[PDB]
Design a protein around this ligand. Sequence first.
Ligand SMILES: Nc1ncnc2c1ncn2[C@@H]1O[C@H](COP(=O)(O)OP(=O)(O)O)[C@@H](O)[C@H]1O
Ligand SMILES: Nc1ncnc2c1ncn2[C@@H]1O[C@H](COP(=O)(O)OP(=O)(O)O)[C@@H](O)[C@H]1O
Ligand SMILES: [Mg+2]
Ligand SMILES: [Mg+2]
Lengths: 274, 274
Amino acid sequence: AMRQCAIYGKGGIGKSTTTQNLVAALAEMGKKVMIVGCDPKADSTRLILHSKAQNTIMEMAAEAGTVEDLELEDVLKAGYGGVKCVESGGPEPGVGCAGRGVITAINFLEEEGAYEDDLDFVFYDVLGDVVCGGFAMPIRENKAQEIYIVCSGEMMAMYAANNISKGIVKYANSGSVRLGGLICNSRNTDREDELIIALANKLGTQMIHFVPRDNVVQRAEIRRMTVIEYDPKAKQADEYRALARKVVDNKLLVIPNPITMDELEELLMEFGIM
Amino acid sequence: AMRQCAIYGKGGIGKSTTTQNLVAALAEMGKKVMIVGCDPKADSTRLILHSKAQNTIMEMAAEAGTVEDLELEDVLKAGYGGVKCVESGGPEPGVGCAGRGVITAINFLEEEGAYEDDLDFVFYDVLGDVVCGGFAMPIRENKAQEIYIVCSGEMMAMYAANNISKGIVKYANSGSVRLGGLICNSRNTDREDELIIALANKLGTQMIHFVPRDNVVQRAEIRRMTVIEYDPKAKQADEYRALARKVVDNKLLVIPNPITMDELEELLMEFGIM
Ligand SMILES: Nc1ncnc2c1ncn2[C@@H]1O[C@H](COP(=O)(O)OP(=O)(O)O)[C@@H](O)[C@H]1O
Ligand SMILES: Nc1ncnc2c1ncn2[C@@H]1O[C@H](COP(=O)(O)OP(=O)(O)O)[C@@H](O)[C@H]1O
Ligand SMILES: [Mg+2]
Ligand SMILES: [Mg+2]
């Protein structure tokens, strides 16, 4: 068995930092993981690979001629803890659909046997500001059974979580894609944990972890490293270990209950965030 | 003559708050303005209309049968200072292309004569996290000659500004779409103004205004109002008046010079933001 998970959320919310640190913690535990980058920013694997970023399947297929001329062993790269890494890529801005590389990449990985029985987890790191094209494909085509949404007390981040949840509902008649939890990536605001707990309850899920804002993240990332590798004794490393443990142990996977803008605004007003 | 302007930027950066306040300041000056909402969030006109939001062209065409059964005078709504307002709308998450409503809306406005000679400005408020589909249409189809990008010292906001600039470059062989400036919507961080000035210089544009972070915005918006209308004496009202004046007087419209991720990271490192 292997658990296919996707991390969604609005841009800049902390998807890639949270995913790579969570996965490093899983590898530290003994799990075999692969990360599939599904964001055109294409820096979703750099902290595992100690790298600037990673060359993308779209880039690599173009140099090889066709995606058929690519070999999986040339594409997947292993970094910290043996974690395997790949980036989808996408067309340049203003050219075609920003999500088109995700479809090509996931199909390539499936055909070439990347989903080896020894893997324990796959994590897709997916742009979540729009839920369409290749960005919706992990949900529409039943690729990620467990969706975790990174958000914060920011209205836009909660709105994005609600929109992703609407996408999950739309495809619930087929497949088994479910909402597994919200991850609050703290803005260091008061009552933010309570706000995200309340949002999760309205959606029917849970706040699986509250990730604190901590400067050690920036110091690790300047050195192209997860906190797990950079400073295994840091408080923040233990936070990512707690998130990883709760993901491993999580059994709540629901069809969520999207809320109205009225309910979103009411949540914001109640917890004094405004 | 009328100047067609578009406000782009990543989600949550301040596009709609900045646009509606800028436009209220223009109306206060005596300008005739229309705002075209091009973001699926569809709350780009609520502060002009004193409203929850505005029903969208996609919603309204569906109830009327066809977009041909819609009348412009039923669609455009006027609020503070006579500013005219319309929302494109878009499909639900997971359904088709998130930007498809923008194409329908702009074509409807053009055919129905919305671009009356008496208008001084049109502002499109456009989602900027992906530059594709209907979100690229104002650039691809030469609808907004002057692009202003709202950003901040946040790496993701600067990355988005760079991506939008790449879209402008891609279509520079036709039409007259140009980058008019960056608007820094402050995160209250040190050297943020200098950082955005430096980014603008590398792109070949300017920082047209630094908008401070000010709680009066939240107090105005709780009451569904621009700061201009809510408290015309507020310091922040004068900030939006300064932005509006500089937009009116701006003559620098360039084909920008997009930068590398290496240059973006170097900017961040230099100004001590990290
Ligand atoms: N818990 C945290 N503490 C401190 N900084 C963080 C934290 N989470 C994310 N960041 C910083 O926020 C920025 C954006 O995070 P990232 O994961 O790249 O977002 P996304 O992938 O959602 O666009 C990065 O500079 C990252 O280092
Ligand atoms: N200069 C500012 N000072 C205080 N709050 C602001 C400012 N600009 C924006 N905001 C707040 O930031 C949030 C997001 O702004 P908004 O314009 O809706 O972003 P976007 O349209 O880019 O998604 C809103 O709650 C808004 O009130
Ligand atoms: Mg990322
Ligand atoms: Mg907006």
